[PDB]
Design a protein around this ligand. Structure first.
Ligand SMILES: CO[C@@H]1O[C@H](CO)[C@H](O)[C@H](O)[C@H]1O[C@H]1O[C@H](CO)[C@H](O)[C@H](O)[C@H]1O
Ligand SMILES: OC[C@H]1O[C@H](O)[C@H](O)[C@@H](O)[C@H]1O
Ligand SMILES: [Ca+2]
Ligand SMILES: [Ca+2]
Lengths: 121, 119
């Protein structure tokens, strides 16, 4: 049961209190409005119209919510995950990150409100 | 225990297998790209720039996911609901947030998962 925020302009991400363990089943709901530069704002799925220019997650759009579990590569979160189990050999603290190009977070604004819970297993 | 899709052009909503009962704790997660007219698509939170011209849900943007429970007013769903508790009682119908009579030109759909949680 973690609840908190993820700033668009935070390159390092938001480390949550959720340690993902082998067999854990998780739910995530992400909401909100944030920008990677422009005056317009996008939701947790990001901007489907914008080209990939070196995103930390190539499998999500610019401005999408992504995560790392432990020492994993980025995993798309987008609007959330429903009763979700990680690939085998993936474990450790969940960090939530705004999908942008490394070095380009200065002009980002807004944030995502995210809830994460462990489910019956 | 319910998984499927909600079409933008379905005025009448998607009637799900979830009957909401007093005290029930539920989770919805909605995903995908849909439209209420334009060639451009929006997500489950809808179009934050477009004004309200008599949307079925005044509490959400045009093109947002909403729902009804039984005979109730529209309730915002947006990207989903996390361990949400609702006198609201009955079958959960999911609906695209648009204006009555004008669904004909909508396109796309949202993916939606609903479950009941521990309580
Ligand atoms: C659409 O924003 C900017 O477009 C120009 C073209 O005129 C360039 O392609 C820039 O790279 C774009 O900058 C924005 O996007 C990148 C991510 O791709 C980054 O977030 C930057 O901070 C933004 O301004
Ligand atoms: O505001 C709602 C309204 O917006 C646009 O004009 C659409 O083309 C219409 O079909 C209707 O959905
Ligand atoms: Ca940026
Ligand atoms: Ca329409």
């Amino acid at each position: 049961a973690w609840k908190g925020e993820v700033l668009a302009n935070n390159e390092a991400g938001q480390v949550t209190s959720i340690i993902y363990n082998p067999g854990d089943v998780i739910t995530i709901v992400a909401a909100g409005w944030a920008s990677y530069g422009p005056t317009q704002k996008w939701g947790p799925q990001g901007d489907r119209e914008h080209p990939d220019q070196g995103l930390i997650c190539h499998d999500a759009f610019c401005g999408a919510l992504v995560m790392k579990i432990g020492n994993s590569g980025t995993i798309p979160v987008n609007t959330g995950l429903f009763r979700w189990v990680a690939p085998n050999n993936v474990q450790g603290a969940i960090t939530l990150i705004y999908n942008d190009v490394p070095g380009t977070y200065g002009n980002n604004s807004g944030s995502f409100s995210v809830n994460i819970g462990k489910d019956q297993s």
